[PDB]
Each structure stands twice: as structure tokens, then as C-alpha cells.
């Protein structure tokens, strides 16, 4: 299996890395592991203007006031258990958001702040019949309402919730109150069941408390029952949110219609569906095991045909110290990160299941040393029924001496491992910034991108509507619209010239500049920077982009095209002239 | 001799050079390993960095000063400080064209530690360092002509008080040293190997020129008090314009075709080489003739030109292997051309000599290029990076935006060989390499480090010993939390405030194990920062929402990382 991609060759896979607490999504080529693109999501990007432009701030809504994010879990939309390459979704733990990225333009196109929760951590997508719902965990228990009268986590109204977002509209679909808390989550291959690990069944706030219980659990959700309850109008609502809220807590030992709690040790972390649809696999973390939940047994569990929730567990292989996450090669083998032992352990799920029945057999096939302290791992197409068993990436949190010293802050080490054969082979050390937690790979032919924008694209449709109110045709017009103390400049751009090369405003005017790049050649991006005003944005071919700033400085102020576009790039400039306040009224 | 160097750095092996890439329009600096071309670290400078809190923390906003209000930057030209014409590994400097700044990075901690807004100019673009006897001055070009004063009374760019200026910053204090008014507009700049001379291309005389500065004469004028000041800046300003055809004393204007661009000093110190851009040539200025030029011993400013090789369409920039060759990017022809400087000089006198050695195709439209140690008299002729603006089909498609293609070229032998295509984001533009042994970094912070000294001072006023204390100080509607942190526990795990209070959280990571970084995020408050071992970091926000609000450690630091959390309780008003 070729490891190196030479000049003029292309990678075989796309890789979508989370940006960690840096807040972006990174697009890598695999197996070269080179970064092809950064997709700003929760960060402010000086280069494209994301978080400065009117289009981006409209997508972010009120959360445009935050300059930070913390993302962990990127996932690609599916149809019938296979990637369809339309959307990628990712969480924000820092400000409790979920974002959707459109894979054809590789931009964030929708974002939602999840109501009545703190900290979106785990996220995964419905697999079958297609990604109708995005499932997201809120990690921290809070009071409801959270108005500062009650702070106690033990109050009957202190809880966290499992969240379902409608993937196509990016509005809330429902929320399910749970006992304990939520960590990671996955979904079955039927659409009926989802599952999440919980580490704080104690509802404590201190370290000792959260480790008190021998087992926490994985909570299993019957989504068909939740939908049935929503259609029956049997739910409540919290605060000013109209999201249906259903109660999945145990009420004095009686289970909810919506949930069942399977005891699992101990502060379990990863929650992964095997690619054959047979198991939810929960990594035991503080327990040196994984727990294997038989998805075929869940209907019987929800029908009261099982005496004990543990009856749905059909294996608990002892793997090593600090199991965190599991992935699958599609040949019947599972691969699990051991954080403390600092290894990846390859094991055979069916032999694990036989050993739980007492049939002594060695289900452990190989342990590979990794460098050092691995968190997530991901095998190519592992989240689909097309898991192809070629590449594995283990994302390690301490790189120590694996790279040149760069000061007190070290890179993460994302290691590429060949699993096409019976023996795992470590082939590449990839340093990365800001702690990617997880990543997802797709075949080159599962992703189709646009090279030029459509003029009706929803990304800037609000800007086109604003232009219409001004009677502007964005494809041709170079006009300055004046409206009181507001000024709206509309121009075309066509390397190496701005369509409006000079305009005059009053000191204090609120200036919006809207640029439509009317080039036809792919790859001729234009930029727009206003010197010393904190204004920067990119405009690609056939895109309309706009940005608003206050002209608070009298005098002459240059603007220039930031993106190299032509041999005469450094001459694509213009002048804003600001008449002083003392020459105008007030 | 062949070009054979190994290009692959396998698991467990280390790169041989550091690469310092400009972050382009994204505004950071990037640290790469060469020859792997992998990104080891991101250093935030003009961008806001959610991961480390740069632009959010009190320490970073203090360094940024008033310019902390800007969320953007546009950088191009990174350069490492020198002693005796060799890298000394102390500082990296870089420009901000978007908001007219120069920043200094300390290479021992890989953080930006000083920043200056250059007064009375618009857009810092070209930038280079004094080489000899060391980097006393940072030289920076302001690109755009503006009125003086720029108060809205005059907009005419041909008014007698409309001009731009060459800028000298004191490298060690990061205060302005002096500015020199010039004719025309400035593009790129370089310095000689003595400290007396510097030079800059000008593209908008409206043949343009390379303006040469006699820095000794400028310094003499400043020491004698013969200068003016502009506006509310105390920076000495000297007039380097031609007045009625009379030369300044501080400057000479050397005619050079055409809209010249790059301005590069050869590593043997002999030449300033200006790339022709619209002219298919480079022009070679003999630095050893400059004293005679400023002494009025030469008939014509063209007499310092000793070579004008014809290279190809669209020469932009030049670098050096230290063996006597120059390497120039041809933007139009989309090539790197290798040529021999001494043979070009002899051709200029009329000898039939072929100075061109090889043309290598690159992909596509190269701008800057950089050979290893080329800015020093130690130029080693091993590696060459050409930074190409249009990558086209060289990488997988990723939508309407495309990556720059930074291509690594083996120049160790007699033939250039292309060995790697490196995609990069937001047009890094230029880069600089240093030997592994030229860079020495700290493993853990020193407690006396200037980076957070202002925070140690605040703590002093509160009577706080940052190394041990876990305390909440109340002062009106201000709340100052001080805590130590030690994975996996925050030293203060809960505190209570009033809605509306202005909260400052100061965290001191007292771990002594390298690489055990901590983070601090306050949920739904837009607060995020990093605290590495022995660092103190601080951040201020207002508690504007009543109720219970969790905070957590963002940096995976421990098996119990998920459980390293705290509670802020906000009492309603
Ligand atoms: Cu957020 S957790 Cu194991 Cu996913 Cu990294
Ligand atoms: Cu438009 Cu460069
Ligand atoms: Cu402290 Cu993770
Ligand atoms: Ca527990
Ligand atoms: Ca000109
Ligand atoms: Cl998981
Ligand atoms: Cl240059
Ligand atoms: Cl040679
Ligand atoms: K790390
Ligand atoms: Na939204
Ligand atoms: Na400063
Ligand atoms: Zn440049
Ligand atoms: Zn250039």
C-alpha cells in the first residue's frame, strides 16, 4: 500500500480533522496527511473574513459574539449506511453549538446554539434510512431553570439532556432528559436505537464523587418511541424554547418508554457501533475492558423480555489499561486505543463474545505501541457498512520527542497505521496543532466539490435580497448607495481591478462593502482589506461577499486585494475618502 | 555532484531544519520541519486564536495594545535576527500589511512578545533586518502614499505633503528609531553586510528605482537633532526626497526597470539584486560602489549597476546557494531560473558568456523563493522552497478556494530537483529556514518570564503568591480569582459572584512535567485559554448570566481529563 504521494500524484482519501479548541475543521489528503484546506466554523478567520463578514455572522446568529470554539467529533451524512458526501457536522463544547458544513463548497452553512444545555460534546449521525437526525450530547448537569436560585446538582430539576437536531433544517427536533450525564454517542443500522455513555451517574461535581460508582452505564434510546410521543403531543417545553422535551429518567425504578440503562464500568468513554451493525461497543476507561451491547437484543430489552439490563451485554474483553475508543476494519476485528498503556490493541469481536460465554480463547491479535497516550482512533469508512480496512489514524495527546522542540506547547501526534494486512504497521507521524480529537476519512469519489459558486446559492442569498431593495443587479453594478449615515457600496471585482476604485463618506458613517467577483476562471479569488480598520474578506469566482465597518477616521484610507490574483496584484487597490466630522452637521 | 538528499523523515526521525512560514492573510506564523514539510506549531500573532487564547487573554491583549481591537492581519515577510551576518536564533520579526504593524516573536518560547503600530503610515509590507554587526534595526516599508497630516482636508496624492516613509524599528526595544520620507512608493527592502546601507525597490515613481539609504548619515542626523516629528509621534523623521533635482544625503535613487519587485542581498555581500517584474531582467547593484555614489564620485546613479541579466518573463524574487549562483522566480514562465552572478556581471560588460544554468518548471506562478540560510553569510545551498500561487490540479479539489503550492527543491547538486509539493492555507507568501542547531527553545516556562510579568505585578498588589495561592479577591464589582492548576484538578473548583461582576481568572500551572498543558474554558461565555507548565495566564470576562456555569480544562492532560472541571455560581441581581 503506497505510503508517499509524490509531486503530481493525488491522495486517495479525504480526511476531515476536527480543529480541537482552535475551532475549525481541517481537510487533509490521506495518506500524505497534508492539510489541503481549513474550514472556519467557530474561530474568526482573518483570511476569508469568517466571523467578520455579514454572511458568516448571519449564519452564526447571536453566537457571532464568541471568538472561540472547541470541536471534537466530525461526521459525514449518510444514506442507507454509507456516506453520501452532502454534509459534515461537528460540535462546539465551549459555547454549546452544532455546525453543518456543506461539502460541495467546503464552508459552514448553518449553525445552532442548542437550547437549555451546557457543552455539546459527543455527536453522531443517524445511519439508516439516512441521516434524518444529528444526535448530540450535552455533557454537564445544570438546573432548570438556571436562574441562580438553585445550584444543587441533586435537585429534581437538575439534569442534562440528549439532543436531536433535524439535519436538513438544522433546527431542534427533540430533547430527552436523562439521569447522570452524557459523554459519547452512536447510532444503530436500523434507525430505531441510539446509545450514549455516561460517566457521572453520581451527579457529582468533584473528581472523587464522579468515580464513586463501580459501574455507570450506557443509556439506550428508542427513537421510534420518542417520535411517537412527539406526534402524540406528549412532551413539555423549557424556557422560551419550543423544542419538545421528553423525560427519559427512571422514576422510582420504573423505566421510561424512551430509555434503558445498561450498567457498564467505569466512567466509560467511547461509544462505537461496529460496522456490521451487531454491537454498541463502550470503552471502559477506568475499567480495563470494553463492554459489547448486542443490538439484536435491544427490542427484547425494551419489551421487558429480559430480566436484567446487563443481559444485553455479550462480551467484555479485557484489553489493557485505559481503553478510550474503538474502530473497525470490516473483517470482524476491532481496534481500541489504550491511553495509559499507550497502544492500539487489535482484537476479534466474535472470539471476545465466545470468551464471555466462558470458552477460553485469545481474542487479542496484536498490540502496537503509539507515541504517546492515544485518544480517538479511526479506520477508513469505519462508520459505514463499507468499512474497508485499509488505513487507521490514532490521535495521540503527548508527542514528547517525536518532533523537533517548539517550546513549552507541543503538537499532537496523529499516527497513520496500515491495517490492510493481519499486522498493523506504523507508517507516518503527523504533528497537529490544538488537539484534534477525532477525524473521519472518505474515499476521493465520495466527495464532489464545486469549483465556482452558483449565483442563487443560499450562502449569500440574504445579501442578494438586500441588493434588490436598493435596486442593485449584483452581476453588473458599481454603485454607491447613500442612506442617512449608512453607505452601501456595491461593486464587481475582476482581477486586477475593483469595480469601484474610490468613494467618499462622512466621518462616522456605517459603511457596507459588497463585492461580487464576476470572474469565470476557477481559482481566481479576490480579497478586500481596508487598511487599519480591521476589515478583511475573500471573494471567490461568482461569489458575493459583504462586510460592514464604521468609517471612524477622517482622511484617505486605502483598500487593497489581499489574494494574489494577477501579475498586477499589488495594483488592485482603491481609496476610501472620509470627510471630517467638523465639516458636517453636529 | 548529484542532488541526492533524503526527503523522508520516518517515524522516530527528526527534521534537520526549522521552517518559519508566514501565515499570509490568516495572520499567524507557522513552524514547519524541513524536509518533511510538516507543520509542528502555529504561533498566533495578528489572528485571534481560540486554542491558546491569544487576543482574549490579558497578557496577549497587553502586548497587542490598542490594536487588540483588530481580529485580522496580513503577513508576508518573516525574518530571524542576526549577529555578524549569521542567525542568532533570538527573534523572528514579521509584518502586518492590513493594520500597519510589526511583531516580534521570541524563538525560545515560540510566542509573539512585542508588537508595534508604525505611526503615520498605511500598510507595512516589505520587511528585512540589519545583518551586521547585528540586528539593531528592523527595516519596514510602508506601501501606500497618504496625506500628512491625514485629517481629511487634503486628499490629493500629489500634494507636497503626500508621501510614504521607510521605517526603522529598534529590534530590542520594539520602539520606532526613525523614519525617512521617500519619493514614490515602497515595495521590498534589504540590507548590506556592513550596517551602512539598506535598499528598497519602488514601483510607483509615478524606469522606477531602487532607493538606497545611508543609514550612517541618518543616524548622524538623528544624533545631531536635525529632524522633524509628525503628528503626535516622537519618532525622528528625515527627508529623503529629491528636492529640485538635488539629492538628500540620506538617499540616492538608482533607476531600475520596471515596477521592480524583489530586493535581495547576495550572501557574499556584493550585490543588491532587484527583480525586474515587468522587465524580463534582474538589476545588480554593486554595494562596494555605494560609498563612491554617496560621495559624489560617480557620474551617474546608473554607474552602480554592474549586471542586468536577461532571465525570462516576470522575475519577482531572488535567493542564493552560497556557491555563486542566484535563483530567481519567473512568475509568467512559471519557473525557477538558476544563474551565475559573476558571469552575469561579465556579460554586462560585453563578454559572450552564458550565465543561465537551468530552468525548472514549478506549479504554478511562483512568487517568493528561499534557499536555506540565504539571508546569511552561511548560506548552505542545500534546500530551496518556491511558493507558488496557483496550485490548480496538484492537490485534491476542496471547493472554490485553493491552497498555495509550496514546493521543496533539492539544490545541493548541480541540477535542481523538485521533491515535494506542500499545500498551504491563505498564501504564506514567504518563509525562512534555520538549522536545527540555530534554534534553542525552552522546555518549560521560567517564572520570571517577561511575557506574564505584568500579571505577576497585579498579583503582587493583591498580596498573592502565584505559585501556591488559591484565593478569590473581591473589589467592588470586580472579582479576581487566583488559582494553581495541576492535572487533573483546578486549584479553585467553585466560586460565587454577582450577576454583572467583572471576573478575572488567573491560573498558574504548577506541573513540572514537560508537555502537560492545561486549558480553561468557561461554557457559553466565549472564554478560552492555555496554561503550559510554570506559565501564568489570565483572562477577564463579565458574568452577565445568572445561574450555574461550568468551566473545564480544554487540553487533554490526564486519564481524568473529562472530569477536570469547576463551577461558577452567579447570583441574580
Ligand atoms: Cu471530545 S473526547 Cu475521547 Cu471525543 Cu476527544
Ligand atoms: Cu486581486 Cu491580487
Ligand atoms: Cu487538565 Cu485535561
Ligand atoms: Ca462515575
Ligand atoms: Ca511605475
Ligand atoms: Cl466515541
Ligand atoms: Cl524581496
Ligand atoms: Cl552548482
Ligand atoms: K497535547
Ligand atoms: Na442557525
Ligand atoms: Na508595543
Ligand atoms: Zn513579498
Ligand atoms: Zn513578492
The 3-class secondary structure across B269-287, one letter per residue, is CCEEEEECCCCCEEEEEEH
DSSP bridge pairs for A14: A29, A442
CA of A438 to the centre of ligand 1 (A): 7
Nearest to A135 by CA among A75, A60, A84, A85: A75
Would you state the cell numbers that stand for residue A171, as one nine-digit string? Answer: 433546527
- Is the CB of A20 inside 8 Å of chain B's CB atoms? yes
Residue A280 phi, psi dihedral angles, 5° rounding: -90, 125
Q: Do B488 and A105 touch (CB under 8 A)?
A: no
The answer to whether position A585 is within a domain reads no
Q: Are residues A105 and A245 in the same domain?
A: yes
Under 8 Å CB-to-CB from B552, ≥6 apart: which residues?
Answer: A93, A119, B519, B521, B523, B564, B565, B566
DSSP state of A20: B
Q: Which residues of A554-566 are buried (b: 16+ CB within 10 A; e: fewer)?
A: bbbbbbbbbbbbb
Report the 3 state secondary structure along A304-325.
CCCCCHHHHEEECCECCCCEEE
Q: Does A386 touch chain B (CB under 8 A)?
A: no
Per DSSP bridges, beta strands B489-490 and B518-522 are unpaired
Dihedral sign computed on CA atoms, order A283, A172, A117, B558: positive
* Domain span holding position A147: 1-460
Number of residue pairs across A and B with CB atoms under 8 Å? 377
Give the whole-angstrom CA distance, residue B40 versus residue B42: 7
Ligand 2 atom having least distance to the Cα of A566? 2
> Contact B93/B171 with Cβ under 8 angstroms?
yes
In this structure, the answer to whether residues A143 and A16 fall within a common structural domain is yes
Q: Which residues of B touch A449 (CB under 8 A)?
A: 397-399
Cβ atoms within 10 A of the Cβ of B436, count? 15
Query: Helices marked H in B155-288 — which ranges?
Result: 215-223
Please state the φ and ψ torsions of residue A27, each to the nearest 5 degrees: -105, 115
Q: What is the spatial distance between Cα B6 and Cα B1, in angstroms, rounded to a whole number? A: 15
Q: Are residues B338 and B301 in the same domain?
A: yes
Residues 6+ apart with CB under 8 A from A582: none
CA distances from A313 to A281, A285, B299 (A): 10, 17, 95
Residues B412 and B465 in one domain: no
Residue A198 lies in a domain: yes
What are the cell numbers at A47? 483570511
Same domain, A196 and A260: yes
On whether the CB atoms of residues B302 and B284 are closer than 8 A, the answer is no
Task: Answer whether A543 touches B (CB < 8 Å).
Answer: yes
The DSSP letter of residue B130 is -
Residue ranges in A32-138 assigned as alpha helix (H) = 54-60
CB A427 within 8 A of CB A420: no
Q: Helix, strand, coil: what percent of chain A each, to 5?
A: 10, 40, 50
Per-residue DSSP letter, B401: S
Tracing cell 423549557 back to the chain, one arrives at A238
User: Cα separation of A34 and A15, whole Å?
Assistant: 10
Q: Is residue A564 in some structural domain?
A: yes
Same domain, A166 and A24: yes
Looking at the structure, do residues A453 and A494 belong to the same domain, yes or no? no
- Which residue of chain B has the CA closest to A532? B99
**What distance in Å separates the CA atoms of residue B149 and residue B145, rounded to the nearest whole number?**
12
Q: What does DSSP assign to residue B295?
A: T
Measured from the Cβ of residue A337, the count of other Cβ atoms closer than 10 Å reads 29
Strand partners, B495: B568
Instruction: Determine the distance from the C-alpha atom of residue A564 to the mean position of all C-alpha atoms in its chain, rounded to a whole number.
Output: 31
Q: Which residues contact B387 (CB under 8 A, 6 or more apart)?
A: B366, B367, B368, B369, B370, B404, B405, B406, B407, B424, B428, B429, B430, B431
> Looking at A394, A425, A460, which one is the last position of a domain?
A460
Q: Are residues A31 and A47 in the same domain?
A: yes
- Structural method: X-ray
Q: In what order do the strands lie in the sheet with A364-369?
A: A323-328, A333-338, A343-348, A364-369
Residues of chain A found within 8 Å of residue B46, distances taken between Cβ atoms: 46
Give the span between the Cα atoms of A520 and A538, in whole angstroms: 16
The sign of the dihedral angle between the CA atoms of A253, A259, A263, A268 is: negative
Distance of alpha carbon A424 from alpha carbon A377, whole angstroms: 13
The side-by-side arrangement of strands in the sheet containing A425-432 is: A374-379, A391-396, A412-418, A425-432
The whole-angstrom separation of Cα A365 and Cα A421 is: 12
- Distance in angstroms (rounded) separating the CA atoms of residues B512 and B320: 44
Which chain A residues touch B557 with a CB distance below 8 Å? 397
Q: What is the per-residue DSSP string for A112-164?
A: EEPTT-S-EEEEEE--SSB--EEEEEE-S-EESS-SSS---TTSTTEEEEEEE
d(C-alpha A493, C-alpha A524), whole Å: 11
Contact of B360 with B333, CB cutoff 8 Å: no
> C-alpha grid cell for residue B354?
552564458
Distance A433 CA to ligand 9 centre (A): 8
Same domain, yes or no: A381 and A467: no
Q: Do A47 and B56 touch (CB under 8 A)?
A: no
Judge contact between B17 and B378, C-beta under 8 A.
no
Q: How far apart are CA A114 and CA A175, in angstroms?
A: 10
CB A138 within 8 A of CB A118: yes
Specify the DSSP class assigned to residue B562.
Answer: G
Question: Which chain B residues contact residue A93 at CB under 8 A?
Answer: 521, 523, 552
Whether A148 sits inside 8 A of B71 (CB atoms) is no
Q: Distance between CA atoms of B556 and B547, rounded to whole angstroms? A: 27
Residue whose C-alpha is closest to residue B567's, from A209, A406, A215: A209
- Paired with A18 in beta bridges are A25
User: Residue A557 and residue B122: Cβ atoms within 8 Å?
Assistant: yes
Nearby residues of B43 by Cβ (< 8 Å), 6 or more positions away: B28, B29, B30, B31, B105, B110, B111, B112
Characterize the bridge pairing of strands B251-256 and B271-275: unpaired
What does chain B come to in residues? 573
CB-CB contact of A271 with A197 (8 Å): yes
Q: Is B26 in a helix, a strand, or coil?
A: helix
Task: Give the DSSP letter string of A446-499.
Answer: G----SS--TT-TTSHHHHHHHHHTT--TTT--EEEEETTEEEEEEEEETTEES
Q: What is the DSSP letter of B450?
A: G
Q: Are strands B356-361 and B335-340 parallel, antiparallel or unpaired?
A: antiparallel
Closest CA to B229 of B323, B148, B160, B284: B148
Give the span between the Cα atoms of A248 and A319, in whole angstroms.
Answer: 32
Phi, psi (deg, nearest 5) at residue B33: -95, 135
Kindly identify which residue of chain A lies nearest to residue B567, measuring between CA atoms: A205
Q: How far, in Å, is the centroid of ligand 11 from the Cα of B175?
A: 7
Please check whether residues A455 and A307 belong to one and the same domain. yes
Q: Report residue A187 CA to chain centroid gap.
A: 16
Partner-chain residue, chosen from B397, B515, B567, that has the shortest CB–CB distance to A451: B397
**Chain B partners of A525 at a C-beta cutoff of 8 Å?**
400-402
Contacts of A201 (CB under 8 A, 6+ apart): A179, A180, A181, A213, A215, A216, A217
Contact assessment for residue A323 and residue A290, using Cβ atoms and an 8 Å cutoff:
yes
Q: Which of B194, B144, B179, B351 is nearest to B251 (CA)?
A: B179
What's the number of domains chain A is made of? 2
Mapped onto helix, strand or coil, the DSSP state of residue B292 is: helix
Q: Which of B452, B473, B493 is the last residue of a domain?
A: B452
Question: Which atom of ligand 2 is found nearest the CA of A565?
Answer: 2
Q: Hunting for cell 447510532 — which residue is that?
A: A187
| Count of other CB atoms within 10 angstroms of residue B348 | 17
B105, burial (CB in 10 Å: exposed 0-12, middle 13-18, buried 19+): buried
| C-alpha cell, B523 | 461554557
The phi and psi torsions of B469 (rounded to 5 degrees) equal -85, 145
Domain membership flag for residue A104 = yes
CA distance B18 to B315: 27
Of A146, A205, A207, the CB nearest to B488: A207
Helix (H) or strand (E) holding B141: strand B137-142
Q: Which helix (H) or strand (E) holds B328?
A: strand B325-330
DSSP string, A224-251: HHHHHHHHTT--B--TT----EEE-S-B
Which of B452, B478, B506 corresponds to the end of one domain? B452
Same domain, A268 and A302: yes
Query: Which atom belonging to ligand 1 lies closest to the Cα atom of A395?
Result: 5
Residues A179, A326 within the same domain: yes
Amino acid at each position: 500500500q503506497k505510503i508517499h504521494v509524490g509531486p503530481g500524484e493525488l491522495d486517495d482519501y479525504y480526511g476531515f480533522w476536527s480543529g480541537g479548541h482552535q475551532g475549525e475543521v481541517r481537510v487533509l489528503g490521506v495518506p500524505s496527511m497534508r492539510e489541503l484546506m481549513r474550514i472556519p466554523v467557530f474561530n474568526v478567520d482573518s483570511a476569508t473574513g469568517w466571523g467578520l463578514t455579514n454572511e458568516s455572522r448571519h449564519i452564526m446568529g447571536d453566537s457571532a459574539k464568541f471568538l472561540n470554539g472547541d470541536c471534537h467529533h466530525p461526521h459525514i451524512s449518510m444514506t442507507d449506511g454509507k456516506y453520501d458526501g452532502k454534509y459534515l457536522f461537528i460540535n462546539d463544547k465551549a459555547n454549546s453549538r452544532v455546525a453543518r458544513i456543506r461539502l460541495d463548497i467546503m464552508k459552514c452553512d448553518k449553525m445552532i446554539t442548542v437550547p437549555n444545555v451546557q457543552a455539546i460534546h459527543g455527536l453522531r449521525l443517524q445511519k439508516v434510512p439516512h441521516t434524518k437526525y444529528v444526535f448530540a450530547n450535552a455533557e454537564f448537569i445544570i438546573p432548570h431553570p438556571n436562574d441562580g436560585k438553585v445550584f444543587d446538582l441533586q435537585d429534581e430539576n437538575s439534569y442534562t439532556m440528549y439532543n436531536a437536531i433535524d439535519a436538513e433544517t438544522m433546527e431542534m427536533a427533540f430533547q430527552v432528559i436523562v439521569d447522570g450525564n452524557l459523554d459519547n454517542t452512536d447510532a444503530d443500522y436500523t434507525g430505531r436505537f441510539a446509545a450514549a455513555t455516561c460517566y457521572n451517574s453520581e451527579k457529582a461535581f468533584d473528581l472523587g464523587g464522579m468515580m464513586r460508582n463501580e459501574r455507570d452505564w450506557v443509556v439506550v434510546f428508542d427513537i421510534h418511541a420518542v417520535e411517537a410521543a412527539v406526534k402524540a403531543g406528549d412532551f413539555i417545553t423549557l424556557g422560551d424554547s419550543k423544542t419538545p422535551v421528553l423525560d427519559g429518567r427512571k422514576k422510582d425504578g420504573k423505566d421510561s418508554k424512551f430509555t434503558r440503562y445498561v450498567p457498564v464500568p467505569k466512567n466509560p468513554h467511547g461509544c462505537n457501533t461496529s460496522s456490521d451493525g451487531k454491537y454498541f461497543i463502550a470503552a471502559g476507561k477506568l475499567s480495563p475492558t470494553c463492554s459489547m451491547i448486542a443490538i439484536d437484543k435491544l427490542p427484547d430489552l425494551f419489551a421487558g423480555k429480559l430480566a436484567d439490563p446487563r443481559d444485553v451485554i455479550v462480551g467484555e474483553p479485557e484489553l489493557g489499561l485505559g481503553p478510550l475508543h474503538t474502530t473497525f476494519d470490516g473483517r470482524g476485528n476491532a481496534y481500541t486505543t489504550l491511553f495509559i498503556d499507550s497502544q492500539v490493541v487489535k482484537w476479534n469481536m466474535e472470539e471476545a463474545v465466545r470468551a464471555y460465554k466462558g470458552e477460553k480463547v485469545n481474542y487479542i491479535k496484536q498490540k502496537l505501541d503509539v507515541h504517546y497516550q492515544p485518544g480517538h482512533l479511526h479506520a477508513s469508512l469505519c462508520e459505514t457498512n463499507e468499512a474497508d480496512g485499509k488505513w487507521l489514524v490514532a490521535l495521540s495527546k503527548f508527542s514528547k520527542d517525536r518532533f523537533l522542540p517548539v517550546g513549552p506547547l507541543h503538537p499532537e501526534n496523529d499516527q497513520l497505521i496500515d491495517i490492510s494486512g493481519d499486522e498493523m504497521k506504523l507508517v507516518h507521524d503527523g504533528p497537529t496543532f490544538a488537539e484534534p480529537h477525532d477525524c473521519i476519512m472518505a474515499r476521493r469519489d465520495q466527495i464532489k466539490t464545486k469549483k465556482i459558486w452558483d449565483r442563487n446559492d443560499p450562502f449569500f442569498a440574504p445579501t442578494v435580497e438586500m441588493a434588490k431593495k436598493d435596486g442593485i443587479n449584483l452581476d453588473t453594478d458599481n454603485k454607491v448607495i447613500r442612506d442617512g449615515n449608512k453607505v452601501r457600496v456595491y461593486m464587481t471585482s475582476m482581477a486586477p481591478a475593483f469595480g469601484v476604485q474610490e468613494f467618499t463618506v462622512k466621518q462616522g458613517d456605517e459603511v457596507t462593502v459588497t463585492i461580487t467577483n464576476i470572474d469565470q476562471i476557477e481559482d481566481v479569488s479576490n480579497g478586500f482589506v481596508v487598511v487599519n480598520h480591521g476589515v478583511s474578506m475573500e471573494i471567490s469566482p461568482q461569489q458575493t461577499s459583504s462586510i460592514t465597518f464604521v468609517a471612524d477616521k477622517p482622511g484617505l484610507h486605502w483598500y487593497y486585494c489581499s489574494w494574489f490574483c494577477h501579475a498586477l496584484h499589488m495594483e488592485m487597490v482603491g481609496r476610501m475618502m472620509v470627510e471630517p466630522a467638523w465639516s458636517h452637521p453636529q
